[PDB]
Design a protein around this ligand. Structure first.
Ligand SMILES: Cc1nc(C)c(O)c(C(=O)NCC(=O)O)n1
Ligand SMILES: [Cl-]
Ligand SMILES: [Fe+2]
Length: 211
């Protein structure tokens, strides 16, 4: 609809992402890339699935299966654009996300929960200070109905009187602190559920992790 207009990355970062993250440690952004780009990502992810590029998560350690995407691979061009779009937002968050100085990230982890009641038990992404400070997730599930299909990400922010229910909605982008501040679970999914995750590194924590 031609009455709607995209917020520039700088505007979205400073007017929303930064304050929301510093206040709540969780930030949801809907309509990130638009319908055309979102569906195209859906196509690329389904292709990865169909061509058998996923490994079951019980080997990586949960009924998930995952594939790592660098972004430049043939057939992953749009996933690549998503990743550069994520980077753009983080860049504009300057050094305003707490006291972090982000200088790098993981590749993209494409995850599939193949319905059949599969999910992910309550966990912390980075409990052992491995350098990862911000989790960034993009969902690409067309017309997801959590009332029927489930698959809600429930986040339990540490020491807060509230929790967050995040439906894995088409074209939804999500940020949260990767550390113990945000334990979270993926509730059982009863339809094919896809997500793409990148983790951003804090320079010092990442350095102290391997050094
Ligand atoms: C560490 C880890 N590994 C996998 C495979 C995940 O799927 C998640 C997660 O929190 N997923 C959240 C979501 O998809 O809404 N975390
Ligand atoms: Cl508020
Ligand atoms: Fe997680």
């Amino acid at each position: 609809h031609h009455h709607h207009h995209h917020l520039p990355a700088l505007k979205l970062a400073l007017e929303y992402i930064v304050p929301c993250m510093n206040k709540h440690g969780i930030c949801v952004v809907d309509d990130f890339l638009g319908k055309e780009t979102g569906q195209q990502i859906g196509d690329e992810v389904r292709a990865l699935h169909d061509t058998g590029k996923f490994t079951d998560g019980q080997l990586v350690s949960r009924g998930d299966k995952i594939t790592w995407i660098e972004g430049k691979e043939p057939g992953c061009e749009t996933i690549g654009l998503l990743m550069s779009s994520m980077d753009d937002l983080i860049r504009h968050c300057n050094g305003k996300l707490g006291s972090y100085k982000i200088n790098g990230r993981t590749k993209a982890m494409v995850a599939c929960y193949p319905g059949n009641g599969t999910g992910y038990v309550r966990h912390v992404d980075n409990p052992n200070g491995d350098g990862r400070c911000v989790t960034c997730i993009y969902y690409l599930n067309k017309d997801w109905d959590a009332k029927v299909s489930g698959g809600i990400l429930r986040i339990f922010p540490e020491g807060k009187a509230q929790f967050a229910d995040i439906e894995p909605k088409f074209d939804r982008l999500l940020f949260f602190w990767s550390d113990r501040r945000n334990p979270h679970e993926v509730q059982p999914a009863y339809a094919t559920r896809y997500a793409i995750t990148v983790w951003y590194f804090d320079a010092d924590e990442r350095a102290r992790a391997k050094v």
